[PDB]
Structure formats: C-alpha cells, structure tokens
Amino acid sequence: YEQDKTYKITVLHTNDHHGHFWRNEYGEYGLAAQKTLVDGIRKEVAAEGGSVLLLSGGDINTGVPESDLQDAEPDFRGMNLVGYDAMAIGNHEFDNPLTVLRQQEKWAKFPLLSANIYQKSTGERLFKPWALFKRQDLKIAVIGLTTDDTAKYFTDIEFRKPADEAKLVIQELQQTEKPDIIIAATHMGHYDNGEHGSNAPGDVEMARALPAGSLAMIVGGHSQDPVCMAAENKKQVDYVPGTPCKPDQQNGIWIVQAHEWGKYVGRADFEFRNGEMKMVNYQLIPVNLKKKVSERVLYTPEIAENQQMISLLSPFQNKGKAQLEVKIGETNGRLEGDRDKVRFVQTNMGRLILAAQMDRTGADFAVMSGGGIRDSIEAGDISYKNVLKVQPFGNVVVYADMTGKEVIDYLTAVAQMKPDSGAYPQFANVSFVAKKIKGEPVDPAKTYRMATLNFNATGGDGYPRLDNKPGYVNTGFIDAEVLKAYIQKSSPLDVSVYEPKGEVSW
Ligand SMILES: [Zn+2]
Ligand SMILES: [Zn+2]
Ligand SMILES: [Zn+2]
Ligand SMILES: [Zn+2]
C-alpha cells in the first residue's frame, strides 16, 4: 500500500438467511429489497473512491418450505445477484447430504469457506479455508470457520476446534500471502462475556485466545443476535431496529452479527492507514422491518424491491408454492386440532406434533401450549399445505437437558395453566393427576431431555423460561418441517397410536 495514505473499506454482512429469499407476509425483508440497499451503498462508496466487501456468516439452508423443497437454489442464485464475496459454512448447510452442498457450491458464484472441517480418512480439508481479495492496493484475506457443534452425514467428517484452526491458518497466511488485513467470517455464535455454557466456545473465546488484533473483525452468525452492546460484555436484550448499534470488541478484535433472515444488513466503515485498521462507523440497517403499533409501520424509509431480483426469484416462489400441494403421506382418521378442543383437553394432534418433536431432538418427553395447534387434518391424503395450516407460525424446535428436580418444578408450573386459554398445555410422555416420565417414576437426580417450541421456551403464554439455562439448545428446525418429516416417515398414519389414554389429569 502507498505509505501514509488513507484507504477506505466498507464491510457489509448478513448471516442465518435460512430460506428467506422472499419478503414475508408483512412485506418485510427478502432478497429483492436487500439488493436495492446493497447496490445503493456500492454506488455511494465507489463515488468516494472506497472499497466494499459483502460477507455472509452462513446458514443459508433451512427455514422456509419454498426454499427447503428446492435445496435453497433460489437463495444462492439471489445471493449471486446481490453480489456476495464469500460465505462461512454454517451448521445447517449439513442438513442435506454432502452432494447437495457440493451442488450449492456450483451454484454459488462466490466461495463457501471453512478451514476446520476435515475428512477423517484422508485428513484433508473438504473446503477452501480462505479467499484473497485485492481492493485497491490492499490484500484482504477472509477466513471461514464453522462451529464444531454441527455434529448434532458425519462419517469420515471431523470438525476440528475453530479457535485452534484459526491460529494455524493466521500463520500460514502471514508466511505465505502476507495479507494487509484478515477478516474471519465465522458460524460460531456470540455469547456475552464468553459464557457459551453447554454450547461449543464461540466468537468471544476465540478472540480472547488469539493474539491481540491479529484479526480486523469477526463477521459472525449462528447464535442469531444483532450484536449491539448495552454495557461491557453485555448485548442489549431487545434491540430496536433503527437505533444505534455498538459492536463488541474483544482483545482488539471487532465482533459483529446481523441477527437473522435478511432482517438487517450490517455496515462497518473502516479507514486503513499505515497498517492501522480503524472502524470509523457501524450500523445495523433494517430491511423494511415494521413495528406493530393496531398497525405495522416501517421503522425506517421503505426500500424498494429490485425488479431484476424479483424476476429471478418469482419462478422459484411459484414453484415451491405449488410443490406444497404434493402429498406427503396419509392418515386413517381425524387428527383433532379444533381450538374449541385443543385448549381444553389433550388431543391426538397434540400427541402427533410432540411425537415428531421428540423424534427430531431425541427428547424423553415434550410439551407445548394448545393455542399453537391451528387446525385439524381430516382422514386421507396429507399435503405439506395441510401441515402448514396446523403449524403456520414457523416457530423453532428446541430442547433442554434438565434434572429430575427441574422437570418437577417446570411441569408443576405448567400444570397450572388453565383450560379455555391458548396457554393450556398439550403433553407427551407425561402422566399425572393434579391437586412419571415415560412410565417410570421421576428420578430426582437424573437428567431428562424435554422438547418444546422456542415460543414457550422463552416465556410465551407465560411458561417458565428454559431460554437462559444450561443444556438449552435451539435446533433451528422449523415446527412444520419437523411435523412434515415425521409424517412422511410414519405413513400411513394410525390415529390409534396417538389417542391420549387419560395419562395426565386434574
Ligand atoms: Zn442459523
Ligand atoms: Zn447455525
Ligand atoms: Zn427477529
Ligand atoms: Zn370448532
């Protein structure tokens, strides 16, 4: 670089896209709007003679039926048109057989990075560990790292420790390419003050374990939080879009994350001079997010939807929408989901839905509030559209490993919820008489696994929070997808097997 010259670099980032290539019901986010936003910033920055780099923290896969049924093809084609430079591989790119990932790699015009995923047999990396970008005189290197919790398709696949692979890699780069700047795009998660709990160490411990400022910044994901600091080592709890956002910085390394689903495009403006990399500004830019006030009003000026992007994706949206009509299985009887009934008594729909949740998570028992079941499935053929009417809100399946004592306190709390309300609890593998888990009595000093929905897990309908506790894991699998997979796996269905035989009572 020319000695003593100020080079301007803007880094744009998103993460945990999860199938959201199209705007939602309320016309929020979607890739067509994101493209107008990004072209806008490029136009701007180019006029000032600066550089732009657009990075992704991973998890493009899994999250919306129309995307899932098409192996996220519209999402990667959309990203190509938005112009992504690189992407870190996320844990959800492994929801499909590796051949599908290799295929998404053929569709992606930009590289998919991950330095820590090895093939056991050979002992070699399966993907490119980094990518080099030349912007003006600067040589910028982007390293990719993937959470080693992903193993939760992994035959002959090893996820080595991110923080340690990062060190090796940072060395190979400096001896080899000698970059002026090094950025890590990672899919590991941000945990306040490194308190990752039962999860694998994330961005904060990595930054604290690496040598001081050996990385300009870490563009993250996985935890899916907009990383805005309220205090030192504390993210704000309910970040409000459109308001100031202060990135975290540990051991001289900036750590950022843009939440999830294309909801925000993060923007970090830096000035590089004589080797000093300086962040002169940061902001989390909302993509047509609206607040419910009732009405839903935009937090910021509306961003128009790029028409070329709309032209590209509209075929995929119609195709995926049509493919919901396809039959996924059959049932020999009515699955009872009428609200006049799922908010008063236990029904077979409740049992089926929770049967599918425990199946995906390996849970010992499960619970959810009755108001979450939105419709019934009459006897006969079942389509994906039929399940989406039952589970239309896209809540996520989570689970919590807890002790006998804890399950007793939780259920006792939940057994309090009253009928004739949406907070009324549907149980599975639990039997009682108010005034045993899976038949056997509850060993107090035993660890049991409970599955439920993120909604109730965080307090929804007033249930006890599991949210902030050790052993809690959000799987990122969507309610309707988990039901749909269980159903086709279990067809033809026999509602007999799901009839509640009076096991819990008051
Ligand atoms: Zn994710
Ligand atoms: Zn993830
Ligand atoms: Zn959100
Ligand atoms: Zn009714």
Curated annotation (Swiss-Prot):
GO CC terms: outer membrane-bounded periplasmic space
Annotated GO biological processes are:
nucleotide catabolic process
Where mainly found? periplasm
Q: Which residues form a coiled coil?
A: none
**Function as written in the Swiss-Prot or TrEMBL entry:** Degradation of external UDP-glucose to uridine monophosphate and glucose-1-phosphate, which can then be used by the cell.
Textual note on the cofactor = Binds 2 Zn(2+) ions per subunit.
Superkingdom to which the source organism belongs = Bacteria
Q: Which gene encodes it?
A: ushA
Might you give the EC number(s) for this enzyme?
3.6.1.45, 3.1.3.5
- Enzyme class of the recorded protein, top EC level: hydrolase
Q: Does the keyword Phosphoprotein apply?
A: no
Q: Which reaction does it catalyse?
A: UDP-sugar + H2O = UMP + alpha-D-aldose 1-phosphate; a ribonucleoside 5'-phosphate + H2O = a ribonucleoside + phosphate
Keywords for the protein's UniProt record, in alphabetical order: Disulfide bond, Hydrolase, Metal-binding, Nucleotide-binding, Periplasm, Signal, Zinc
Q: Native species of this protein?
A: Escherichia coli (strain K12)
Residues the record lists as binding substrate:
R339, D340, K341, V342, R343, F455, N456, A457, T458, G459, G460, D461
* Matches recorded under InterPro entries: 5'-Nucleotdase_C, 5'-Nucleotdase_C_sf, 5'-Nucleotdase_CS, 5_nucleotidase/apyrase, Calcineurin-like_PHP_ApaH, Metallo-depent_PP-like
Q: What is this protein called?
A: Protein UshA
Q: How is its activity regulated?
A: The activity of this protein is inhibited by an intracellular protein inhibitor.
